[PDB]
Design a binder for this molecule. Structure first.
Ligand SMILES: O=C1C=C2C[C@]3(O)COc4c(ccc(O)c4O)C3=C2C=C1O
Length: 331
């Protein structure tokens, strides 16, 4: 009657064998920096939860980025802080440089290293085959690191991957949806941007894990080598799963549903319809072919799998021959 349970096939117990203080962010005591070290220069963007500014550290005149956190649950604020501290120093993880507070009002803000990024809507149009391989490898380093440290990012998308292209510099940002993995825990499926949501999320399977990030990465990869961003473009969450089924096919989707004994909304049957699995080669045209290779398609095919347990891990992905030239020239 109920859905079959699942656990991560790698890094399953990394929080289990770490001390309580590592993952119990509720108990963490924050060490506050000095708010008056930073001057805001211009608003960079705003979410539902935060507003983000370019700023200057006036003690050394370095650029930073300041994210002022709206009146939300302190628990959510502490989770992001603990995660950023836990991951600090990891490869291509955005550095949390400081945590400050208006000393009179309650209002906390996170201070990050500045990345002089090129906007992905502009950058992706200009990347070469080698650039994509290089940057995908760099994202994989970050994901393997944070997974190995017991953390799911849960919001992997181009806007959260900052690239200073002239310095070949990449940082994975926005850890505000990130969460500690504990085996058997049922997580909120309302995470990730619509276009990067895994099948587990769209069918309301809550016992997911690190492999969610690997789907999102697969979605990014597709959008880059095929020059179609985003690759799966649904108008809502139901339609998002339909866009996926039109490429991956409905037969493998129903096998997935069957294996985990997942109960699908009645709605879904009529709209999912019946679709053959398409060959990846179908999305190759004159304009994107210089970015596509047999290795790329084989790699992509091993990321975009319905069954979260069958997707490559970050370490397996880094071993794929798609990256041979990158690994070779990084040793
Ligand atoms: O949790 C977050 C959230 C953001 C949002 C945002 O502030 C947007 O834009 C940024 C940036 C960081 C550096 C940077 O150079 C930049 O332009 C961002 C973050 C880093 C994080 O860890």
């Amino acid at each position: 009657s109920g859905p079959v349970p699942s656990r991560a096939r790698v890094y399953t117990d990394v929080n289990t064998h770490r001390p309580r203080e590592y993952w119990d962010y509720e108990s963490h005591v924050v060490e506050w920096g000095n708010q008056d070290d930073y001057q805001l220069v211009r608003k960079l963007g705003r979410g539902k939860y935060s507003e983000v500014f370019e700023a200057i550290n006036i003690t050394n005149n370095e650029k930073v980025v300041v994210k002022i956190l709206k009146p939300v649950k302190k628990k959510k604020i502490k989770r992001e802080i603990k995660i950023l501290e836990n991951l600090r120093g990891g490869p291509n993880i955005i550095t949390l440089a400081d945590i400050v507070k208006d000393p009179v009002s309650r209002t906390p803000a996170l201070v990050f290293e500045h990345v002089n990024n090129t906007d992905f809507k502009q950058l992706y149009q200009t990347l070469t085959d080698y650039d994509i391989r290089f940057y995908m490898y760099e994202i994989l380093k970050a994901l393997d690191y944070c997974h190995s440290m017991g953390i799911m990012h849960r919001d992997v998308k181009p806007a959260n991957v900052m690239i200073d292209h002239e310095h070949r510099k990449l940082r994975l940002i926005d850890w505000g949806l990130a969460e500690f993995y504990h085996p058997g825990q049922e997580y909120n499926v309302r995470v990730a941007s619509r276009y990067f949501k895994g099948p587990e999320l769209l069918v309301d399977y809550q016992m997911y894990d690190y492999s969610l990030d690997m789907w999102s990465l697969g979605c990014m990869l597709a959008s880059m080598i095929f020059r179609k961003e985003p690759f799966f473009h649904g108008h809502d969450n139901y339609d998002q799963l339909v866009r996926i089924a039109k490429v991956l096919g409905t037969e493998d989707l129903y096998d997935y549903i069957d294996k985990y004994n997942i109960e699908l909304d009645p709605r879904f049957n009529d709209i999912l319809g019946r679709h053959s699995r398409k060959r990846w080669e179908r999305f190759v045209h004159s304009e994107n072919q210089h970015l596509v290779s047999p290795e790329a398609l084989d790699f992509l095919d091993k990321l975009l799998r319905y069954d979260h347990q069958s997707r490559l891990t970050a370490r397996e992905a880094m071993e794929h021959p798609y990256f041979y030239t990158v690994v070779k020239d990084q040793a």
